[PDB]
Paper text:
The NAD(P)+-dependent succinate semialdehyde dehydrogenase (SSADH) Sad is a member of the ALDH superfamily and oxidizes succinate semialdehyde (SSA) to succinate. In microorganisms, SSADHs operate in the degradation of various nitrogen-containing compounds such as putrescine or arginine, where they prevent the accumulation of the toxic SSA intermediate. Our results show that Sad is a surprisingly flexible enzyme that is not only able to detoxify succinate semialdehyde and glutarate semialdehyde but can also functionally substitute erythrose 4-phosphate dehydrogenase in pyridoxal 5′-phosphate (PLP) biosynthesis and glyceraldehyde 3-phosphate dehydrogenase (as well as phosphoglycerate kinase) in glycolysis under physiological conditions. We show that Sad, which primarily functions in the detoxification of succinate semialdehyde in various degradation pathways, does not only accept closely related substrates, but also converts phosphorylated sugars as a side reactivity.
EG2.2s had acquired a non-synonymous substitution in sad, resulting in an amino acid change of Q262R; while EG2.3a, EG2.4a, and EG2.5a were predicted by the breseq pipeline28 to carry amplified genomic regions that encoded sad (~80×). To understand the molecular basis of the improved enzyme activity in the Q262R variant, we solved the crystal structures of both Sad WT and Q262R variants with bound NAD+, as well as in complex with both NAD+ and SSA. While we were not able to obtain structures with sufficient electron densities for the alternative sugar-phosphate substrates, we manually fitted E4P and GAP based on the NAD+/SSA-bound structures. Potential interactions for the coordination of SSA are shown as black dashed lines and important distances are given in Å. f, g The active site of the Q262R variant of Sad with bound NAD+ and modeled E4P & GAP (based on the position of SSA in the Q262R variant, taking into account available space and potential coordinating residues). R262 is likely responsible for an improved coordination of the phosphate group of E4P and GAP. Moreover, in the Q262R variant, E4P dehydrogenase activity was increased 17-fold compared to the WT, reaching 800 nmol min−1 mg−1. Further kinetic investigations revealed that the Q262R substitution had significantly improved the Km of Sad for sugar phosphates. Km, its affinities toward E4P and GAP were increased by 75- and 16-fold, respectively. This improved the catalytic efficiency of the reaction with E4P and GAP by two orders of magnitude, reaching kcat/Km-values that fall in the range of enzymes on their native substrates (103−108 s−1 M−1). In contrast, in the EG2.2s strain that harbored the Sad Q262R variant, the Sad expression level was unchanged, supporting the finding that the single amino acid substitution was sufficient to increase E4P dehydrogenase flux.
Author numbering:
A (entry chain B), B (entry chain A): 3 to 462
Amino acid sequence: ITPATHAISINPATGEQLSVLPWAGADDIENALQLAAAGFRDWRETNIDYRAEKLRDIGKALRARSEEMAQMITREMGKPINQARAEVAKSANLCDWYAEHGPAMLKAEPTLVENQQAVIEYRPLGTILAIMPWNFPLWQVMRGAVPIILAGNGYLLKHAPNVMGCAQLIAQVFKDAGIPQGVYGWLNADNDGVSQMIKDSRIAAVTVTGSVRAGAAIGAQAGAALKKCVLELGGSDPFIVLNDADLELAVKAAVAGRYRNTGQVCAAAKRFIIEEGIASAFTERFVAAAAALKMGDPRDEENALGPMARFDLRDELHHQVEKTLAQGARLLLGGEKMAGAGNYYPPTVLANVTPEMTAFREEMFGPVAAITIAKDAEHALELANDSEFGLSATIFTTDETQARQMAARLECGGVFINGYCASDARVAFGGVKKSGFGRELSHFGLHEFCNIQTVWKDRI
Amino acid sequence: ITPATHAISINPATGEQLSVLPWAGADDIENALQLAAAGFRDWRETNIDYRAEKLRDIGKALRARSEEMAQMITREMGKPINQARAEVAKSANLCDWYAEHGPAMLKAEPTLVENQQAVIEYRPLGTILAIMPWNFPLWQVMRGAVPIILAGNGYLLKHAPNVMGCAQLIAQVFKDAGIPQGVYGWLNADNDGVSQMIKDSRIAAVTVTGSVRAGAAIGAQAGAALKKCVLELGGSDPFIVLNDADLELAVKAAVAGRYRNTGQVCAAAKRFIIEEGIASAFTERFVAAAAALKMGDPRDEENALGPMARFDLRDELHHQVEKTLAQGARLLLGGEKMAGAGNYYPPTVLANVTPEMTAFREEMFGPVAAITIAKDAEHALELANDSEFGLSATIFTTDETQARQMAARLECGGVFINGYCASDARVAFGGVKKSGFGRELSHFGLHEFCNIQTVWKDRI
Ligand SMILES: NC(=O)c1ccc[n+]([C@@H]2O[C@H](COP(=O)([O-])OP(=O)(O)OC[C@H]3O[C@@H](n4cnc5c(N)ncnc54)[C@H](O)[C@@H]3O)[C@@H](O)[C@H]2O)c1
Ligand SMILES: NC(=O)c1ccc[n+]([C@@H]2O[C@H](COP(=O)([O-])OP(=O)(O)OC[C@H]3O[C@@H](n4cnc5c(N)ncnc54)[C@H](O)[C@@H]3O)[C@@H](O)[C@H]2O)c1
């Protein structure tokens, strides 16, 4: 059993092999595409209010399996159990939210054409192929699947190969809810299987959450096949603290933003950009708060951090730490792989990080904070924008006039002023630059995979 | 002078070489990108009401050169002069329409977040690279440039190599209007130059109007570079006539839809799908009406059709005609290349066209109507959707409820019921399947190239 023939689940806290699953064969892929096509054909004809009711059924079936799902998330990728439980609750609440607010967003639009001759309709597009990651194994699927299916599309999940136990449980939830065959489906396809599906006429569009490299590989294939794609490819979000900040609130938001989900968050606070006058006080408070975080067995609710999800990615992250230290940064906390069977990396703080260093230019997808000193607010904006990424950003300053101006100039898709960054059904999510393009949640996640259709009567 | 080194204009009505222009060099490309970056940096700071006034200045500058522009359009690609004049009028009115209605579409959205803490802002993305075709040398450019620039983006035009006289005149109009260099810019880039610009960080996104082959080549590169693209790649629009249609109006709309711009329209009526009871009457009327169209010198206003734009594309169209005849269709009108120096192809009607034939499966980008018989309305819908394309469609029937149900089942981005298909600033434009993805005009054209940005204050 090698990762060249199988999807493999390993518990990152213990090292034990949980499950293996061979890649989908040519028959498996063809069967899934046939059922997706048949399911979409029938699903697109359903009434919107019936689909809204089915979303609520998904929410009930998810809550009914809430602890089983949370434990599967924790077991396969190491997330603290209360964060996994929160992920389940957030995902079930998303079902109910789109059931209530989604239908109105799909109503026909009036136009300025005289005599009400023309309207805009939001029609289903087809089956959307979804390529998803391990860090929120449930929420990442539901964030797209819920509005996509509400809009009359089908959804075909290609999940990360280390969370196929989560993928099977999600399928069971959709089965429990009575979602027809082919409307929600999933496949353990290897990269070639994905390539084959992108080229297949029964896949209408593609959505990807993952690495920049995956986004570039899949986006190129989608474009070559004339398939629209949405790409969410991670981030290196700046977290700016100016001299007049509420320092106690800023440190709390800084610690939560960097170290939630053991740092494995696309929109984690990854680059702390601190104005010079407050930098010493921020750094000392931040290091002390990070050092008080309890880490260990993620089934134990006293622990705020678990192990990292993937052994090879802990090696990558530690290598990023070593290079950054070799480049001249200072190690203030952590910075060594923990011995033992678990994939643990301690909360880590690097300081004296300059724009040329590895921890400033690459996504640090684990519990490693990078602290950079800014000379003033204009330098802080320049440092914040000096990134290939552009997902989200935080600004802490009590000057509301300065905050709003920096938001208008921050090169990212979401700006949080004096608060905690998060994704939320009620607001758009997604970024710019190498973080990708397209928007999820609110009405944006509904409409991205609609056929927006002008219907015009009696144009004579 | 060779096609490997130069853009070349030839008058299709006479075969006379008009002009040549060498491809941009490395220095030209870098200068255009530097201008674009400097122009966007300043333009994004302007007030939206200022930009709206600048749109009005564009409309004024364009009308002031309306006849110079129209004659250049007709001279370079063969369009009947009054259709070229109408193209100018429609483009100038688009400037005024977006100046009046655009700014309100760019206001921040409220959200359902508590305490009015979060809004959605529509920020510009950057410089949009636009790859455009020769069939509407002005309107294709303005359709995107006007909303793109209004949203605070820059626009960098790579026009079709046979209309660089048009491209130069468009640049002069923007300069007459006082639109800064780089905010509207253009380059005579070859394909490699386009590839270099797509990879350059000073290009934020790409928009393409052209062939399926061009959209696949460019879309693949945009995806590989993590740049959003919008693709409009032509169509094979069905035109459905049921037994209860207003037959006189249906034939008029049928003829106008197929033969406008000598057939060279993405959203032309290309596949006529006629219910069996009315098929003989429709076909007789349609052949007679098409045979009454005058073709010749497009400077002479008595002509409804001109020569086709490109000699090689007349050859391609006639090859598609010959293959369709060889497969079993019946030639009712035209069907032969005219002798002489001009690139003339007569109005042509193919009957007994089945879904397996070349004229049913490929885009027929010239004055060639295909007529297919449908047994009933359900067969008509199946025939209409049996296409790799999906741009627009027409339904003629007095059963207004049947029309509405068929529209909800047509796999295309626009459906015209008992009327003339057209693009219009007030409604969405763009299709599905191999016709591409993304939407132009109305608020869609403004928002496709925005950074849709969540700004959320005090999330604590
Ligand atoms: N944006 C995010 O939420 C997110 C999530 C996980 C990882 N990441 C980033 O990616 C890095 C690596 O983690 P990863 O290896 O799991 O990321 P990954 O991109 O390799 O995995 C993401 C998903 O894309 C699929 N995938 C990757 N390459 C593919 C290809 N060529 N064809 C088809 N499918 C393909 C994977 O199977 C998985 O389902 C992390 O350190 C982090 O920086 C980002
Ligand atoms: N959608 C439309 O409105 C439209 C317009 C013109 C042509 N077409 C279709 O395309 C057929 C051929 O006409 P055409 O040869 O002018 O189409 P074309 O796609 O080759 O030309 C379209 C534009 O794209 C550019 N282009 C093409 N390939 C490119 C590449 N690889 N890299 C960079 N730029 C590239 C061309 O220079 C031109 O500016 C027509 O017969 C018709 O079927 C469609």
